Fold this sequence. Notes:
The protein is α+β, with helices and mostly antiparallel strands. It has a single domain (1-153), classed as Nucleoside Triphosphate Pyrophosphohydrolase. The protein has three helices and seven strands; from the N terminus they run ββββαβββαα. It has helices at residues 56-67, 124-130, 134-147; strands at residues 8-15, 31-36, 43-44, 47-48, 83-88, 93-101, 116-122. Helix 2 (124-130) packs antiparallel against helix 3. The radius of gyration is 15 Å and the shape is globular. Bound molecules: adenosine-5'-triphosphate. Residues 36-40, 42, 44, 85, 87, 89-90, 115, 133, 135-136 line the site of adenosine-5'-triphosphate (ATP).
Amino acid sequence: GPLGSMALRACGLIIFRRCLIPKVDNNAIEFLLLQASDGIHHWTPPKGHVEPGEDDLETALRATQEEAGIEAGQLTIIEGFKRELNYVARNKPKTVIYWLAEVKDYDVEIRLSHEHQAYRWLGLEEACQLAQFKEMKAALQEGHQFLCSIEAL
Ligand SMILES: Nc1ncnc2c1ncn2[C@@H]1O[C@H](COP(=O)(O)OP(=O)(O)OP(=O)(O)O)[C@@H](O)[C@H]1O
């Protein structure tokens, strides 16, 4: 079979819980993270495998509720921000698109999948500390960077 599709299409959701008012005027926003069920036990947001016929954000949305139980209706996908991570995992480059999302519930339900055994809620520093992977450290980095350029929507 003469393959023609280069790399694998993926889509994740960079979730962030926005608190009411600021505390120490430093932090305020958090990020949802899902620890891998094996390997290096790295922490990454709900990423899915978007199909050519499937939508980009949807794959990231479904993956959210699939690997976190939270759907677009339970969060808030911020528009204007879009970045994808390209890298060959086992032996195939996966393109992971990331969208900023804010869960309406602070204690929102967290329904993970087989691909995730645990999750966490941390800011940029921590989300970056766990997501040792530079690519992710950036996704979460730009997230807070962009959101800080908006207002609330
Ligand atoms: N940002 C990244 N850049 C490059 N490689 C990464 C990045 N994040 C994770 N990886 C690695 O890429 C691989 C992705 O795992 P795999 O392709 O097996 O996905 P998966 O099937 O979604 O995961 P799982 O086995 O846990 O179900 C792992 O070895 C992981 O450590």
